[PDB]
Amino acid sequence: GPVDMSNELPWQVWTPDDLAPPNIFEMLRIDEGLRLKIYKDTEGYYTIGIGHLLTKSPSLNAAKSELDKAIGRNTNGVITKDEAEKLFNQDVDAAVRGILRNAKLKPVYDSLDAVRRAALINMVFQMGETGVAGFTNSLRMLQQKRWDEAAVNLAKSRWYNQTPNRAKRVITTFRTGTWDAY
Amino acid sequence: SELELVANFADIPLRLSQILKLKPGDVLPIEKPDRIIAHVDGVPVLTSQYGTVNGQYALRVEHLINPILNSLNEEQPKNNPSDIDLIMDIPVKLTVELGRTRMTIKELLRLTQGSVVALDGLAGEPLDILINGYLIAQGEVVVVADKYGVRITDIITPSERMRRLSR
């Protein structure tokens, strides 16, 4: 031990969350776009701003209301660009925070270099933790740096089938470890 | 060429009597900060998010504090239209530093919102604790349940704390 300290309470040494990698913010603006009014997203759920999922399930009243709590004002289902911006900021951090606390996603995230971690956040940003943690074999493949194998498996998913142009970009990022798809 | 960007994790308002009694193992309670201020020569220059990159502590610059509008591509105007037996028990602030990085001027002036700056401190390795801008101790951020603190791991003698304090 480096020190000889009298320990009364169960204090645990704390380390902060990893910072989001570059260029996740530009990446996500590209894939999520921007809307200042509530819409149904490519997976059927109410969304706002830059991919900010409002309610997991029906409907607008709850959406507008969870929007109302998210923004802290009456909104009427409409927000500001800078409101969208601050939601986005929060969302990116909350995604990273969630991954790092997810017993299944965390070893994969840790494995990956920065560019590929962006891709994983992008997925989680799109489908949430529970959804992304379901790609069991693709994840283990990612953990084991079998890039082509994970890549070809990922193209065999509902996700890819529902949003091919986004999924292709993300899978190209997983496969290559580069930003050429952006 | 060349200054020090200094990230302050936390400021801890203590009384001098507490400071003279501090020892390894003492835990100072703090609020976990979300944003923090980085300074240069004691002058706050930006606020930022913080975390780690490659195991190093790092900053994501959020806002420049009172930035200057670049108007160097135009001529300067002549005017601007905008023209001791018993020692007193004083409160004293302990500064806990997340870390520092040496940067050139050119490098410092070329960061804005979203700039990620890596500090020279490793995650896990103890933090500098200062008094009046003087190193007096090291500590580690520590937590139980909901409560955060800074646990002293190493510290100079009371006489020396006093010495750095006065100067």
Residue numbers in the entry:
A (entry chain A): 1 to 182
B (entry chain B): 17 to 99, 144 to 227
From the manuscript:
Proteomic analyses have identified the major components of the sorting platform for the Salmonella typhimurium SPI-1 injectisome: the AAA+ ATPase InvC, its regulator OrgB and the proteins SpaO and OrgA4. Here we show that a novel, heterotypic interaction between SPOA domains serves as a scaffold for sorting platform assembly in both injectisome and flagellar T3SS. Our structures suggest a partial model for the subtype-specific assembly of the T3SS sorting platforms: the heterotypic interaction between SPOA domains within a given T3SS subtype functions as an adaptor for ATPase and its regulator through interaction with the APAR peptide.
To elucidate the mechanism of FliH-specific assembly with FliM–FliN, we co-crystalized the FliM(SPOA)::FliN fusion with a FliH(1–18)::lysozyme fusion. In contrast to the OrgB pseudo-lariat, the FliH APAR adopts a near-linear conformation along the ‘top' of FliM–FliN. As observed in the SpaO–OrgB assembly, the FliH APAR makes extensive contact with both SPOA1 and SPOA2, supporting the observation that the FliH APAR interacts more strongly with the FliM–FliN heterodimer than the FliN homodimer. The FliH–FliM–FliN assembly is characterized by the burial of several highly conserved hydrophobic FliH side chains. Two tryptophan side chains form an aromatic clamp, which binds hydrophobic pockets on opposite faces of the FliN thumb. Similarly, the bulky side chain of FliH Leu15 fills a hydrophobic pocket on the thumb of FliM. The binding interfaces for these three residues are formed by both FliM and FliN and are highly conserved across species. This structure presents a conserved model for FliH–FliM–FliN interaction, which is distinct from that of SpaO–OrgB. It should also be noted that while previous investigations of the flagellar T3SS have focused on the interaction between FliH and FliN specifically, our structures and biochemical data show that the FliH APAR more strongly interacts with the FliM–FliN complex than with FliN alone, suggesting that the FliM–FliN complex is the physiologically relevant binding partner for FliH.
